[PDB]
Scaffold this active site. Structure first.
Site, mmCIF file in Angstrom:
data_model
loop_
_atom_site.group_PDB
_atom_site.id
_atom_site.type_symbol
_atom_site.label_atom_id
_atom_site.label_comp_id
_atom_site.label_asym_id
_atom_site.label_seq_id
_atom_site.Cartn_x
_atom_site.Cartn_y
_atom_site.Cartn_z
ATOM 1 N N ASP A 170 0.013 1.071 3.689
ATOM 2 C CA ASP A 170 -0.687 -0.202 3.419
ATOM 3 C C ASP A 170 -1.188 -0.262 1.983
ATOM 4 O OD1 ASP A 170 -2.340 -2.509 3.429
ATOM 5 O OD2 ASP A 170 -3.254 -2.024 5.314
ATOM 6 N N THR A 171 -0.416 -0.887 1.086
ATOM 7 C CA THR A 171 -0.835 -0.954 -0.320
ATOM 8 C C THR A 171 -2.122 -1.784 -0.506
ATOM 9 O OG1 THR A 171 0.628 -2.838 -0.688
ATOM 10 C CG2 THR A 171 1.531 -0.750 -1.193
ATOM 11 N N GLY A 172 -2.434 -2.658 0.433
ATOM 12 C CA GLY A 172 -3.651 -3.476 0.301
ATOM 13 C C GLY A 172 -4.946 -2.806 0.759
HETATM 14 C C1 LIG Z 1 -3.527 -10.018 6.917
HETATM 15 C C2 LIG Z 1 -3.989 -8.799 7.718
HETATM 16 C C3 LIG Z 1 -3.516 -7.545 6.955
HETATM 17 C C4 LIG Z 1 -3.919 -6.207 7.595
HETATM 18 C C5 LIG Z 1 -3.125 -6.002 8.898
HETATM 19 C C6 LIG Z 1 -3.595 -4.796 9.728
HETATM 20 C C7 LIG Z 1 -2.750 -4.696 10.993
HETATM 21 C C8 LIG Z 1 -1.407 -4.297 10.913
HETATM 22 C C9 LIG Z 1 -0.625 -4.220 12.078
HETATM 23 C C10 LIG Z 1 -1.213 -4.540 13.315
HETATM 24 C C11 LIG Z 1 -2.547 -4.938 13.414
HETATM 25 C C12 LIG Z 1 -3.305 -5.024 12.236
HETATM 26 C C13 LIG Z 1 -3.661 -5.075 6.583
HETATM 27 C C14 LIG Z 1 -4.740 -4.903 5.535
HETATM 28 O O1 LIG Z 1 -4.345 -4.308 4.421
HETATM 29 C C15 LIG Z 1 -6.039 -5.263 5.759
HETATM 30 C C16 LIG Z 1 -7.213 -4.965 4.821
HETATM 31 C C17 LIG Z 1 -6.930 -5.220 3.323
HETATM 32 C C18 LIG Z 1 -6.610 -6.672 2.984
HETATM 33 C C19 LIG Z 1 -7.711 -3.564 5.014
HETATM 34 C C20 LIG Z 1 -6.907 -2.537 5.527
HETATM 35 C C21 LIG Z 1 -7.433 -1.244 5.700
HETATM 36 C C22 LIG Z 1 -8.751 -0.970 5.317
HETATM 37 C C23 LIG Z 1 -9.575 -1.970 4.794
HETATM 38 N N1 LIG Z 1 -10.889 -1.728 4.440
HETATM 39 S S1 LIG Z 1 -11.290 -1.191 2.969
HETATM 40 O O2 LIG Z 1 -12.696 -0.946 2.851
HETATM 41 O O3 LIG Z 1 -10.505 -0.003 2.713
HETATM 42 C C24 LIG Z 1 -10.872 -2.425 1.993
HETATM 43 C C25 LIG Z 1 -11.777 -3.471 1.689
HETATM 44 C C26 LIG Z 1 -11.348 -4.567 0.908
HETATM 45 C C27 LIG Z 1 -10.033 -4.601 0.412
HETATM 46 C C28 LIG Z 1 -9.550 -5.787 -0.379
HETATM 47 F F1 LIG Z 1 -8.708 -5.509 -1.360
HETATM 48 F F2 LIG Z 1 -8.889 -6.559 0.466
HETATM 49 F F3 LIG Z 1 -10.561 -6.533 -0.759
HETATM 50 C C29 LIG Z 1 -9.178 -3.537 0.747
HETATM 51 N N2 LIG Z 1 -9.608 -2.482 1.498
HETATM 52 C C30 LIG Z 1 -9.039 -3.254 4.658
HETATM 53 C C31 LIG Z 1 -6.358 -5.872 7.063
HETATM 54 O O4 LIG Z 1 -7.483 -6.128 7.473
HETATM 55 O O5 LIG Z 1 -5.309 -6.220 7.955
#
Ligand SMILES: CCC[C@@]1(CCc2ccccc2)CC(O)=C([C@H](CC)c2cccc(NS(=O)(=O)c3ccc(C(F)(F)F)cn3)c2)C(=O)O1
EC number: 3.4.23.16
Lengths: 99, 99
Positions: free
Chosen positions: A25-27
């Site tokens: 997950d690059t995001g």
């Molecule tokens: C559009 C939904 C995308 C996704 C899908 C997850 C999924 C996949 C298959 C089946 C069910 C669900 C993947 C994803 O990267 C995130 C977010 C980032 C946008 C995410 C993923 C992992 C951890 C976090 N929390 S964090 O604290 O590490 C964090 C906080 C904020 C951000 C920012 F860049 F988005 F702001 C990124 N990471 C967030 C999420 O919440 O759901």
């Protein structure tokens, strides 16, 4: 390897002596696993994404191996819908996005 | 381009003639943008994130320029922490994961 994005980029990862499937997950800033046992000290934190926030346990200096690549970093544990490998660990295996 | 992951993979995008920031997210099946106007009719969709489920509006055949590459596809609109480019458009611009 070179991984296309037609489907979810799921890989087998070795963590805490177990083999598990995890999403690349690059995001994701961080790496979150569904409930599992890990060694050492932890602290409770709150992380947010789509759908809001979840409380997770932060474990530091955790060994992982993804497709033959070893790394160490922070691993979170809590009620994520699936195991996700985030950037803190993707950098260490030398993962990039290319187009 | 080759994009490393030491920072969030945020890029400038052009959608509806406007410049916006969006995250390149291989963990997302779909592309979701914060509340905005898009042309045409929409349909209801529920999607999961690491925080839980949200309801969104689904627009089809939306033109979007991503880091200078043109994509025309499905764009969801709803409550999201930020704009996210998912695999449905990542694949259109020729993006792969490499390590
Ligand atoms: C559009 C939904 C995308 C996704 C899908 C997850 C999924 C996949 C298959 C089946 C069910 C669900 C993947 C994803 O990267 C995130 C977010 C980032 C946008 C995410 C993923 C992992 C951890 C976090 N929390 S964090 O604290 O590490 C964090 C906080 C904020 C951000 C920012 F860049 F988005 F702001 C990124 N990471 C967030 C999420 O919440 O759901």
């Amino acid at each position: 390897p070179q991984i296309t994005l037609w489907k979810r980029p799921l890989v087998t990862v070795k963590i805490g002596g177990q083999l598990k499937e995890a999403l690349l997950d690059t995001g994701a800033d961080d790496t979150i696993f569904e409930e599992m046992s890990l060694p050492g000290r932890w602290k409770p934190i709150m992380i947010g994404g789509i759908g809001g926030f979840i409380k997770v346990r932060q474990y530091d200096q955790i060994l992982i191996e993804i497709c033959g690549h070893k790394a160490i970093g922070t691993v979170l544990v809590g009620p994520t819908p699936l195991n996700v490998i985030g950037r803190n660990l993707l950098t260490q295996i030398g993962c990039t996005l290319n187009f």
